[PDB]
Write a protein that binds this DNA or RNA. Structure first.
Ligand SMILES: [K+]
Ligand SMILES: [K+]
Ligand SMILES: [K+]
Ligand SMILES: [K+]
Ligand SMILES: [K+]
Ligand SMILES: [K+]
Ligand SMILES: [K+]
Ligand SMILES: [K+]
Ligand SMILES: [K+]
Ligand SMILES: [K+]
Lengths: 17, 17, 17, 17
DNA sequence: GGGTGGGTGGGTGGGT
DNA sequence: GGGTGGGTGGGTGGGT
DNA sequence: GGGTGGGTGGGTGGGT
DNA sequence: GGGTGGGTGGGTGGGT
């Protein structure tokens, strides 16, 4: 996943797809 | 709480302690 | 529930939906 | 963990120790 | 669970 | 959380 | 695995 | 990683 993501946004990157 | 208790009995068992 | 709510307003937020 | 455990009891076997 | 049970009982207890 | 809040709201929601 | 489980639990645990 | 996140998400993902 993209390095900039933090927190919830890391998990949501995979969820959103 | 003991199983045989019902209704207000269940709450009051906790109340009484 | 929204953070600003207090007291009865918290409960009624759920109640009113 | 012991094979018999299921569900919540698997996670909690690690939590207890 | 409901709002006529109350809100200084609390909000990860549930309403989802 | 308390027991003048009620017990067909429930007990896996929690309880000096 | 899912996104109402949460993000100070972590991203080398995975997102078949 | 924690157990107040849930257990029909899984246990070869990891576990002071
Ligand atoms: K995640
Ligand atoms: K996760
Ligand atoms: K009660
Ligand atoms: K009660
Ligand atoms: K309420
Ligand atoms: K209540
Ligand atoms: K677990
Ligand atoms: K887990
Ligand atoms: K209550
Ligand atoms: K997890």
């Amino acid at each position: 996943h993209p390095g900039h993501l933090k927190g919830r946004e890391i998990g949501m990157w995979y969820a959103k797809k």
